[PDB]
Amino acid sequence: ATTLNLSYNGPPDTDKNAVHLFASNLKRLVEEKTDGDIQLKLYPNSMLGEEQERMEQVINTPSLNIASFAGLSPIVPEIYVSAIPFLFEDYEAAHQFFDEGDYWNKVEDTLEERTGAELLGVIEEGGFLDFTNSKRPISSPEDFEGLRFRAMDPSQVALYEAFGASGTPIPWTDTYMALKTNVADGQMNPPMYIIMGSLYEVQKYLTLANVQYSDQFLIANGEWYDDLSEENRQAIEAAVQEASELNREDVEKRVDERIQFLADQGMEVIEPTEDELAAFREKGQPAYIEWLTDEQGIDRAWIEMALEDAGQSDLLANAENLYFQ
Amino acid sequence: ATTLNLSYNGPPDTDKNAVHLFASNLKRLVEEKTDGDIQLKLYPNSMLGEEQERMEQVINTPSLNIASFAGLSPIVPEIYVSAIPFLFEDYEAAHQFFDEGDYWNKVEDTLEERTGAELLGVIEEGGFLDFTNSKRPISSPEDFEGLRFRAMDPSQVALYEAFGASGTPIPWTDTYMALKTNVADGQMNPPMYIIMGSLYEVQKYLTLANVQYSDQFLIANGEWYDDLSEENRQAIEAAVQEASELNREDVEKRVDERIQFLADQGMEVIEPTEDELAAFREKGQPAYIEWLTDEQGIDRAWIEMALEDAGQSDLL
Amino acid sequence: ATTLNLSYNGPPDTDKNAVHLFASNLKRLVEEKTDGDIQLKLYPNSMLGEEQERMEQVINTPSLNIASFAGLSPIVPEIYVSAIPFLFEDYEAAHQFFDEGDYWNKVEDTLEERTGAELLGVIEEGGFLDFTNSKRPISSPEDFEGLRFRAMDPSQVALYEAFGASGTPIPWTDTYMALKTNVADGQMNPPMYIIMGSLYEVQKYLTLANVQYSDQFLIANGEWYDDLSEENRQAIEAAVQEASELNREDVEKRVDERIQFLADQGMEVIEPTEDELAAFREKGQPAYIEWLTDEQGIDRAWIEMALEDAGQSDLLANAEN
Amino acid sequence: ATTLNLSYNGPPDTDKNAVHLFASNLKRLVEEKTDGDIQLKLYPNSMLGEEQERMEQVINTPSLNIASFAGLSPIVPEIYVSAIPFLFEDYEAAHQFFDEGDYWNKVEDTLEERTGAELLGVIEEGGFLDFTNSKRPISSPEDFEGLRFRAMDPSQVALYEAFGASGTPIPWTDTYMALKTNVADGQMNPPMYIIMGSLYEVQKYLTLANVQYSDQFLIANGEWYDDLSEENRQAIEAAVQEASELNREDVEKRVDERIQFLADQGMEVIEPTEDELAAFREKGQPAYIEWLTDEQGIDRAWIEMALEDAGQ
Ligand SMILES: [Cl-]
Ligand SMILES: [Cl-]
Ligand SMILES: [Cl-]
Ligand SMILES: [Cl-]
């Protein structure tokens, strides 16, 4: 049998870490479906390295890695298109987007062309993203003015600047401390990570913006994957699909529980009004799309495919028009 | 409005050139669905160049090109997997393979990665491929031994070698002359091309092997295509699919009529027996797969993906 | 005439920022040698973004960027070979290695093939790298044991781990606070950066290890550069060479005074013994070279090329055997 | 030990095939300098396939291949810049260009980046290229008008068209028969190939245009090459350099004798004057450079780098 390392973030606690839930289910399913020929050894807590280093590991050694935007975006910045604010109207749309969409199919091939690595699946490990901060209630974009937010990656920085704040990239493993010591005022993440990182200890205000879909990415070493027998490759694919489905089911049924847990720990929870959500969208969405095409140089095809796959084919044209004089 | 060149092979006669049928329907459909914003100008009969040059043209200038294996295989040799002999039991199996298969998705992305150009569709422009020659009837693999065939591309060379014949690449636009002057004894193509090139004038023996699916590939310049608006992109995509369906329907209806035409021009037509067809498969198919895997060195993962698409995993 | 933005780290203070010295000289020289046809506008303080964002900007918009390993290594990890510990015995060895070596020429081509961007030069913006920390004096590799260091990029993590320390990547613009709040015990940089980031206010011990060459990388947008007239391209090349020379001259002259400044601010300055320096090298080199080949997937041809350029070809087989 | 196939065109006859001279010297020197660790098995006469087939072999399997423009140009069209008509005044100009030039270094790196394969050397296997045909003598660019030439690759098609001829790509191994049967009227190659393919039997007219540098390209599978030890890497490099220089010396000394052999077989030879060459340059050079930038998408930067390396 062949044993592969599987690295991911957060503690080996199923209740508190949806990525651990996925990793554990994947280990069980891979070992079963390959009749024990492939075994996974779990390395939680980002113990083998932070995001850049774990990408290097999976690209160059027979292993698996669960990466965030921090790991993947320097190599495939085209993933930024999937984080257009308010791209997905519901969970179903995101599922269809990643499972069958032409854009994501190309993202997968692009990662393989550039590094050899295989993007095997998209792990839902939280609900839609919310904001937290320690300074003041945030109910609308205007309330960001002057604040400094921690960013996972440059796309978060772009969003914060669109709202009047500033942003700084800080690794996940240093985010609690950054917030504790006021290096940053706030961050963004689904309830799952806000709980997992105990961010409620160092953040008072939770804003239910539901601005982006929460995901991480299962990556496999290319040489290993391509040398599998077809039988084992098909087994791995089925195991990934099943574990992915299990995570979607579990995350979605726990979102409201997790938000109420944050309230029960003392966080002040703000539910933006319709107008406030419209303001987040109008301030955030066209500015983000402009950032994609200008600073990030992403061509129209990449964006159009994604919009089609999500069911909002007109957002690019509408953003261009909003700004046309 | 923008006007783009569309280059392709064969004379601009829609009844004798299934590629011109496709190009003409595509032009009509693109102009309609874009309300004139995108116009196509047809450059038939390979007038702008042979296959390599036309690939260079489409890669580097806003334009479209319909390419054969000869033009595409040097850039994406992985397309050879789609030409495994007897891979498709019928037209429907081939359509599902290209329309839905994972392997073809990867081929499309690989072209764009290597050149920027976009592979927009797979044009069915003849029935399954047959053999012609000027030396003797061919009814079994053994009848190839010693003959020298014209090849479109290296994958045909491999197939010919599997049957004991030699093969050499010669452009389509020199194929009539190559056969007339006996630079080669034979070639392979669907009836459509055998008629189109008047090859029955210089070939006597036709073998209905139906050995490979006949296709060509619609390619668009990437810088142009990938900056189109959503409206124009969707229009072109819809036009391509529609034109592709119209070609499949037309080609499939006319295969038997085209064979009849060849017989009328004096070709001696052999329809191999069930047993002879099995022999062609049992010699040609595993030899071709070994050529893919162990001679050309195309990685197994590519091949296995295509076989899964085709419902033929058993072949490897 | 045209105007291009040039982004880089640190304040627009020549005395405290050798990258600003370079940017200022390059601005002056480019304007002069192009007879005003190309003008540079200076964007210091990393104001247009941290390292990843700025690489995206220079790849996709007509502009120039001065990038660190943090910006470039995710795209061209082959640059890690140039940071093998103690690869360069003196500044001159590094100058010829980057200016004309076959390895660096291939790195240049690799960046261009992957992104279109042009690696115009290697800016010397400090002396050789030293260590700082707040916990204890470091004189031998063993003194790293149990410490946690801030890393610019994964190559520093690998070096730390070779000495029994841990490493955490933290952007430059948050490194002072990471040290103040004890997220990390230490970091590594030449005296220039230790001063520029005021790290002496939050670090006590300075070890003069002189372990790696300090550089950053001048990158130009590809479409912009390739569309220049031949005259202007040559003018830019000349300006880059001259500004690079000016920086080498200034940085090298000022290393000792910068160490004096750090001592005067209260840092305890330690020079490892010859035995200890040998131990740093004997432990650091083979571990680093194994990291290049194993974890980073860098093939033998790449490492071989760099070692030949550096006059150190035997290190690869030695790290293997 | 490792036995690698080395594929190339033409018969295993040292006297009649400069590529066999090279391949045989390479085998000898590679096995000596690696103390037997690397052994070559020679496959002359394009036995393992024509140009396209062999390129895929070397890209994907441990092996070596000597490729022409026909094999390399679909993958690295940037090689077309090295074939600008009249780019090189003499052999030494060409040698400096390929040996030291920035443009060629970029070509080498580009092949590796796209395919993993390593371009180890530029083999001189004939003198500068000449024109042959069976229809009429060529002394003026206008003599090409109405002729149909065989092309190795699209760059020859472009050159023929610049002069008013047509061109069609036909593999080397079919060129003799294409000319015999008048599928084509003419072709271009150095005297070495005109002799090797017996083209003098099917061509009457030879013009010593010396219009392009004759080369082929030694390519090695990347996975194999870039994992070599410093010792074996330096050994292969030294063998390639030594064998390359042996070919340059032998080819250059034999050009005049090879031309005389062709005259002795009945070919009518025209040796253009400086004024005649100027007319070919005026009609061929500007059109070719425009074709590079327009149709082939090769940018100004690549072309100017090459012109500088060539001292133009
Ligand atoms: Cl959640
Ligand atoms: Cl047909
Ligand atoms: Cl310094
Ligand atoms: Cl010669």
SS (H, E, C) B19-55: HHHHHHHHHHHHHHHCCCCEEEEEECCCCCCCHHHHH
Residue A249: strand, helix, or coil? helix
| Residue environment code for A240-250, b if the CB has 16+ CB neighbours within 10 A, otherwise e | bebbbebbbeb
With beta carbons under 8 A apart, name residues in chain A contacting B109.
105-106, 109-110, 113
CB contact under 8 A, B308 and A105: no
Instruction: Return the ligand number nearest the Cα of D19.
Output: 4
Q: Do residues C228 and C296 touch, judged by C-beta distance below 8 A?
A: no
CA atoms within 13 A on the CB side of A162: 22
CA terminus-to-terminus distance, chain D: 47
D304: nearest CB among C105, C230, C316: C230
Write the CA distances from D5 to D47, D59, D221, integer angstroms.
11, 13, 11
Contact between B152 and B70 under an 8 Å Cβ cutoff? The reply is: yes
Q: Name beta bridge partners: A151.
A: A169
C-alpha to C-alpha distance for A217 and A122, rounded to whole angstroms: 5
Q: Terminus-to-terminus CA distance in chain A, angstroms?
A: 64
- Residues in B touching D168 (Cβ below 8 Å): 50, 171, 173-174
* D271, D208 Cβ separation under 8 angstroms: yes
In sequence order, the β-bridge partners of residue D269 are: D206
Residue B67 — left, alpha, or beta (φ > 0 → left; ψ -120 to 50 → alpha)? beta
CA distance B112 to A106: 10
Q: What is the DSSP string of C35-48?
A: TTSEEEEEE-TTTT
To which residue do tokens 């047993």 refer? B275
Are the beta carbons of B148 and B182 closer than 8 angstroms?
no
Sign for the pseudo-dihedral over CA of A256, A259, A261, A263? negative
Residue D104: closest CA among chain C residues belongs to which residue? C109
Supply the DSSP symbol for B141: G
**Cross-chain residue pair A178–C174, CB shorter than 8 Å:** yes
Q: How far apart are CA C20 and CA C25, in angstroms?
A: 8
H runs (alpha helix) in chain B: 18-33, 51-60, 69-72, 91-100, 102-115, 154-162, 175-180, 191-196, 222-225, 230-264, 274-290, 300-310
Q: Which of the listed CATH numbers 3.20.20.70, 3.40.190.170, 3.40.50.720, 1.10.287.130 matches domain C1-321?
A: 3.40.190.170
CB C169 within 8 A of CB C151: yes
Residues B174 and B197: beta-carbon distance below 8 Å:
no
Considering only CA atoms, which of B170, B1, B153, B161 is closest in space to residue B75? B153
Mind telling me how many Å the CA of D226 is from chain C's nearest CA?
Answer: 5
Q: How many angstroms separate the CA atoms of B138 and B144, rounded? A: 7
CB atoms within 10 A of CB D187: 29
User: What token pair was written down for B64?
Assistant: 């479209």
Residues by chain with Cβ below 5 Å of ion ligand 4? D 126-127, 190-192, 255, 258
The stretches of A126-214 forming alpha helices (DSSP H) are: 154-162, 175-180, 191-196
Nearest Cα of chain D lies from the Cα of B300 at a distance, in angstroms, of 12
Q: Are D219 and D149 in contact (CB under 8 A)?
A: no
Among D105, D227, D230, the residue with its CB nearest the CB of C313 is D230
Question: What separation in Å is there between the alpha carbon of C18 and the centre of ligand 3?
Answer: 9
| d(C-alpha A60, C-alpha C296), whole Å | 6
Number of CB atoms found within 10 A of residue D92's CB: 10
- Superfamily of segment(s) D1-312: Bacterial extracellular solute-binding protein, family 7 (3.40.190.170)
DSSP state of B137: -
* Structural contact between residues C291 and C159, judged by C-beta atoms closer than 8 angstroms: no
Residue D264's Cβ-count burial label (10 Å; 0-12, 13-18, 19+) is exposed
Neighbours of ion ligand 3 (CB under 5 A): C 126-127, 190-192, 255, 258
Which residues on chain C are in Cβ contact (under 8 Å) with A77? 56
Helix (H, G, I), strand (E, B), or coil: what is residue B312? coil
In a mutational test of the A interface, the residue from C9, C45, C50 whose CB has the highest number of chain A CBs within 10 Å is: C50
Amino acid making up residue B201: E
Report the interhelical angle of D154-163 vs B51-60 (nearest 10°): 90
Of D55, D168, D177, the CB nearest to B50: D168
Q: CA-CA distance, D274 to B230, in Å (whole number)?
A: 58
Task: In whole angstroms, give the CA distance from residue C72 to residue C91.
Answer: 22
Residue C253 CA to ligand 3 center (angstroms) comes to 9
Question: Residue C47 and residue C12: Cα distance in Å, rounded?
Answer: 11
The dihedrals phi and psi of D3, each to the nearest 5 degrees, come to -100, 125
Task: Give the angle D222-D224-D228 at the CA atoms, nearest 5°.
Answer: 110
Give the Cα separation of A42 and A13 in Å (integer): 12
Fold of B1-316: D-Maltodextrin-Binding Protein; domain 2 (3.40.190)
Q: Which of C292, C166, C283, C83 is nearest to A61 (CA)?
A: C292
Could you tell me which residues are beta bridge partners of residue A5? Answer: A41, A63
CATH of domain A1-325: 3.40.190.170
Question: Which among D20, D3, D237, D238 is positioned nearest to D120, based on CA atoms?
Answer: D237
Residue B85 CB burial class (10 angstroms; 0-12, 13-18, ≥19): buried
Of D109, D226, D227, nearest to C109 by CB-CB distance is: D109
Q: D169 vs B50: CB contact, 8 Å cut-off?
A: yes
Edge-to-edge strands, sheet with D268-270: D166-169, D148-151, D186-189, D130-133, D205-207, D268-270
Q: Provide, as residue numbers in chain C, all residues whose Cβ is less than 8 Å from the Cβ of A174.
A: 168, 170, 178, 183
SS3 B307: helix
Contact B229 A113 (CB under 8 A): no
DSSP class of residue C267?
A: P
Q: Which residues contact A302 (CB under 8 A, 6 or more apart)?
A: A78, A81, A103, A106, B226
- From residue C28, alpha-carbon distances to A134, A152, B214, C33, C243 in Å are 45, 37, 64, 9, 9
How far, in Å, CA of B46 to CA of B66, rounded? 10
In the three-class reduction of DSSP (H, G, I as helix; E, B as strand; rest coil), residue B216 is classed as strand
CA-nearest residue of chain A to C177? A183
Q: What is the residue whose two structure tokens read 């991480």?
A: A216
User: For chain D, how are helix, strand and coil distributed in percent, rounded to 5?
Assistant: 50, 15, 30
b/e sequence C116-145, b meaning 16+ C-beta within 10 Å: bbbbbbbbbbbbbbbbbbbeeebbbbebbe
- Which structural technique was applied? X-ray
A73, A158 contact by CB (below 8 A): no
Taking the centre of ligand 4 as the mean of its atom positions, its distance from the CA of residue B123, in whole angstroms, is 46
Phi, psi of A83 (to 5 degrees): -110, 15
Q: What is the Cα–Cα distance from D112 to A21, expressed in whole angstroms?
A: 42
* Closest residue by Cα to residue A240 from A74, A23, A52, A46: A23
Name residue C314's amino acid. D
* Nearest alpha-carbon partner for D133 in D172, D186, D197, D169: D186
**Chain D residues in contact with B174 (beta carbon < 8 A):** 168, 170, 178, 183
Contact A278, C41 (CB under 8 A): no
E-only strand ranges, C86-191: 118-123, 130-133, 148-151, 166-169, 186-189
Closest CA to B180 of B162, B160, B161, B203: B203
Contacts of C115 (CB under 8 A, 6+ apart): C59, C75, C222
CA of C29 to the centre of ligand 4 (A): 50
Domain boundaries, chain A: 1-325
Helix (H, G, I), strand (E, B) or coil at C306: helix
What is the torsional sign of CA D45, D47, D53, D54? negative
Please state the φ and ψ torsions of residue D64, each to the nearest 5 degrees. Answer: -125, 155
